[PDB]
């Protein structure tokens, strides 16, 4: 005779699974007690995660609304059809001109999507470089020919730089190499770029060469539904993003594509219109995934109604006003940053004037639970180890910090930075001999102990600390 | 000034968007007032539900554990260890001789995430065919030449078929193809197979072509999992699957592939090991994925607690008695189901010598609150419309029904495929036509208020009917 | 100073170059003392021989008639027309309906410029397999993945086999593999069977799968041009063919290709026409070769006007009464042929039932100055070494010889194989072991006499036995 | 009743096709009576032509020299022996460190095995851009994407460039690009540029991002046998050519290709030997072609015996030397050379100050019996049509031309731009209406008259003027 429904299908995490319902309460304090700096974090709503676990897991529902492989459909249908308008409507496109996917699995699944909807096998794609700031998506073989992203693997890709001096993108190299490569696909957006994107002039170049122009504007998409960046819409062809980062939604993707009449182009037939949707819907489901996520497009619909609302456009402007703190806390102090500010959500800090690599300084930063990354800087693939780190505002702005505590922020950086200068000049520079201060260091315990008092100090969403199993 | 984090960040859904709650609401009484027969279909626990969502989708994970691009991680990688280290003991793995990567973020990205690993693009990969009860994922292109699967668009496939008569596997037309195309990787598992599968046979076709050796067994994991159904680990080289379906976990996906010392074989060097791990591990990430949803990650490691229980084992011999209880059921009103019975969970019913396509009765059953799919028959490729429908017990019985019960659902199919007939009789065969007797029929109506009745009469994991908003 | 132009430039070759010119004078000699079997052979005109050795060798001439890259082509433009309308004509073929580029240097050249043209990379192509007695350009990859064919390397190919009891093509097992691989292009025609074709049902089954249909005539274009074959052009979109082998001209190739309105189909617009002809043509130049070899064409105008010629229709049908007469012959002994015939210009000998390979058989052949080669048989691949050799009538026929001339040459062929038997009955059958018989071998050495005795007794084309520098 | 050998198989072509005998010498009178600037043209020897239209046509010879398929190979193995020695002496390899291979049936088939035998399909392959002087078998593509080169079709190319301002390959710009593209093959080697290569620099190059190192030597393989150019062989890994051109044999090609131990590299294994003969000689044949042209092989014999002698190295010095006597005299008028000068065989001639296109240059010196060719200009492709010419001496040389006849040649060709510009002048510059000065045009009529006979004062070698039908 079966268990019954009741006991393994109705009670609760805590007693069916101690051990994982444990582990999940060590991360929720973990998540409080730490300075998130991560760029490409956020931390999402209760509501989001209400909807994100529920029973709409449940249901199989392959294929779009209106032309389902089966039935049962009826309130799948309605989630998916409001979780598309809801995504026009936060990015202000006209339905007219302007449709969505909200399927993909995540950022990833999205990109890989609308390559294989809009291109064939070992067509060119060009995206920003790897230690430019791009994302692995793009694009990315190393110098010994070795291909790691599956873009360079199904695709012929080559990279565009940021110039080496100034820390932009370089807008006349881009359009000297797309001119002699010619890509099918010109891809746009980035993972760790200081600055907003000009797409009108990449509009002008891939009207050059001939190319499709895609964004992928995963890292920025909550400051461009905020109309606080450029828009992409304005001049690409199809707009890829992540649900989560900056958009703080589920872990998803969705891709935009344009419809409609095309614009007047040179020597082409009057009354053209786009032909992406039904490429892209069809590389979607049949062609690469199975059924969608619907917890997934469910707890999005929720995250796109919190986009659209005058609380996020200000959690947008205050998300860059903390970068600019940022960013002129450290060059106060004397520290160098990419560009010398920012302009989204991010900074990029030089730590070559240090002596120093962003190796070193994440390792450390991680003991004293602060997590940021180790990046390139100024486009550089030559130095053994990446000469900076990047760091974002999105998580941490999300808990209620501003500026005077991106400021405290700013001057816990310092001191992480000064003690790991203290231990390369007792130690030295070899990681063997680095990591000799690593352990038993007094220093190093008690920015630990400061930031933790701070961090725990701020609010959370997405539950409640006054209930969590571990409040210290 | 920001809104206070409360106000947005801990406000609950109901109050937050309302509309998706109450859409919500609605799936949660579909969900339990029809009868549920869609083969891939099942109904996950609570417990299940609550790691799903968790504060866990707030961490990036990028790599593995041990081996992270972020740090932050340490919590995150206990999880993922438990998980990898749950998902060997489900599957009665020795842990020297398996591995296993749970980051894919569902069935099909685990299999191409395979294919990406083990294979070149243009390799070429045999699958059965889709007609013959295969998957997309294992490749799928049309008389016309459309490569529909992504398999199909990277690499060279070429389905294998059933036996057009009997319904089972045609090893030896398999044999013959296998020996003619020589593909790179041999696929076995499928969506709309009703018996067993002799992986026996796999392996010495794919070594006499040299071929990888892959199983599928994303419908059947959960038998598997209680030792309800022959082995693929027994044989093949790499096992993909879904950890929904039968196996009753979150959405998500598993590769697992052979570590450690070779078995013998002629021209290999002495001491050789397998090298699929690291290829698997990149593949899945830097090459094709991203961040691991590490609340999908957390909830299959409950899933997998809950599945390597004796209570599950309960479960999937129950699956697999209440899927031929109800094939008997049809056989004794005279309903012919392919290969006249079944080895696991699903039924592939016949109805062709009823005159009737699988879209109608598919429409007809949808419209009573009976989810179930067309699909072809003996791999028939031909006909107009598919001339089946396949049936399957995996979410019923999670619901808690019996053979007696699951003979019940027999007679409502009965009575369905009856008013399918009646209105065949009076409006014709033509789609356009038969619509016709599908507004405002009162038999129509009165089998979908039994269907309901009936339904409502069980109890349903992964939330409280007794709290739901539309009782 | 300069060398005068005179010395070296005007000089003959027998002065210029000695040992080469004693090389080809030994060469010649050989052609005129043996019995020349290869199937793929044939003895050609010295018309032909005198505009292949021409001033023609002297021009560059890249691209098609009207339509140059260079100046200075206007007798080059008028022999190319005369070619292409001369080799129409032979083939009787509508100028309206056909069109023909004659530049391919060789039959393989021809056939890859068809695929390319007509296909992407990696398209599906099905040809007849190796073994069974297809040709290595339609497609050839061993059991163990080795892409052997260029066919194979940059196409996905699939073969078809014969009747593995009958040695005819199976027609049934072929459409059950086209419906199944669904290639893009299916290729009829051979190097080593024995029987006309059902060009009919290939259009069936090229019609059912969707695919492009090329007939590969090569071995048998002679025959086609006197109507002494089935007639490709009638069912197949495009023909490739060697010039040499039967047809008894220059080294080249030739593509077909159909022109002008297609035949009523499916989803086809009313008017449409065949669209062949631009992408053959571009495919020779500029995608695959460079300069014409003007030469080349040359002589093949004239072998193609010695080819629509009433003579030649008798010598085509004495090609086929020779190799029916040897066939008969070889059967009248005991010998075994596949399909118990030929309705061709070859002949298929089993040498299973003779416990010999068609290796041994081919060597001791040579050593007696009788050519032809080893071949598998039943289209088995399965066996150590080919079972069979293969005999053709061409060569001989164009020396005069009759049907009972070719009765003598079945007599040779038996004391052959006899010698062979003796020999694998006195030294063994492994091959190392045998090829000690093949030394002072006093019934070899006589052999070998009385073949070249009975060759140097026939007329020879293409040069005058009679000023030969070795006549003896 | 067959027709008797003698009638179609004896009896010479002027009886048997006098339509093909007629145009031939029509065609003979046309090479003889004019003034052959095509810098890849060459007018070859009687020795040469007399193997080249031999018996040697009549013999199938699948395999190499000790690896055939079938037998009767005896004197085609000596034969081919034999070129592939006399090549690697003429071009002073070792042949312990360089192998040839003599099959391929012309320039681009050789370009085309190499690319076969050394690299995968889609594999990056860099060459000179066809505007900068690169040839079509090294790659390209057009603006709009176009695959136009099989080399582009099959594998992924991408062209580098010369100097725009002084007309040099740009080093610095290919090396850049190498280390961005990272190519498996780099090609050195040229159709029109007019100075040696610097080989040393394309291998540290190579060397760089782990590329092959590949010479197409075409245009220059005559130059680099009298070592009157830089040698490829000492740096590149596979060298390929055409046998015509500055070479003077027939149509055909060769690829060379290292042997034996590799030289000492960081990160390669202790005894490490190269592994290209296998890989190409199996690329040639069974991959690509079919049966050897042995006429070609024989003749290619000649001509390579012909190549190694000193009076080829007074040759080869005095085509350098009538090029550069050329563009002196060119240069003496006031007209524009590209560089300023030449070190090899041709002369680029920049028409863009005189306000005139090659196109119309090139249609009024083909009017006036002067062969030379459109060209473009410092690696110039924005132009409407080629801002030059490109003139070659090799065939004008070898009809016994010295300094002195080539600055008479430089006069003809001052007086043939000065009537473009007239007619240009008249009635303008579309070339619709630059037509109407080409007909019924004294001067015009005068010029062609004086190059016609001033050509018919040399000596021609290839056939005897004083036997040919159309005297004057």
Redesign the interface.
Known sequence: ?????????????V???P??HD??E???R??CR?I?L?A????????V????????????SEGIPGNR????N???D??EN?CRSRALEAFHCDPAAWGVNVQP?????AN?AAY?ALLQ??DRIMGLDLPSGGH??HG??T???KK???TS??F?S??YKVNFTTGYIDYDKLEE?A????P?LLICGGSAYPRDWDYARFRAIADKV?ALLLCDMAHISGLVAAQEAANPFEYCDVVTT?T?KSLRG??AGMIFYRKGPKPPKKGQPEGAVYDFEDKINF?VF??????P?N?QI?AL??AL??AN?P??K??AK?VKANAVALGNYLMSKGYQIVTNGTENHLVLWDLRPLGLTGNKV??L??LCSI?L?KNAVFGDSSALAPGGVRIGAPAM????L?EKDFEQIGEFLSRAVTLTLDIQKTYGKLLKDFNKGLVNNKDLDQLKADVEKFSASY??????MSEMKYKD
Chains 1, 3, 4 share one sequence.
Not at 105 to 109: A, D, H, K, N, V
Not at 397 to 400: A, P
Not at 459 to 464: H, I, Q, S, V
């Open positions: 005779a079966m268990e019954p429904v009741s006991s393994w299908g109705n009670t609760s995490l007693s069916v699974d051990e994982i582990l999940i060590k991360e929720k973990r998540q730490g998130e991560i490409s974090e956020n931390f999402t709503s209760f509501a995660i209400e909807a994100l676990g529920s029973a709409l897991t449940n249901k199989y492989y089966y039935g049962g009826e309130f799948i309605e989630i409001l699995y995540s950022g990833s699944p890989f294989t096998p070992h692995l998506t990315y073989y110098s010994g020919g790691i992203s599956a693997i199904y012929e080559l990279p190499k001119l002699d490569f010619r099918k001939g992540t989560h589920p872990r590389a049949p062609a690469l995934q199975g059924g996520h917890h469910g619909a929720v109604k919190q609302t609380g996020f200000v959690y205050q994440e390792k930063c991680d997590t990354n702005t999300s808990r209620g501003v609010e959370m969403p997405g539950f409640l």
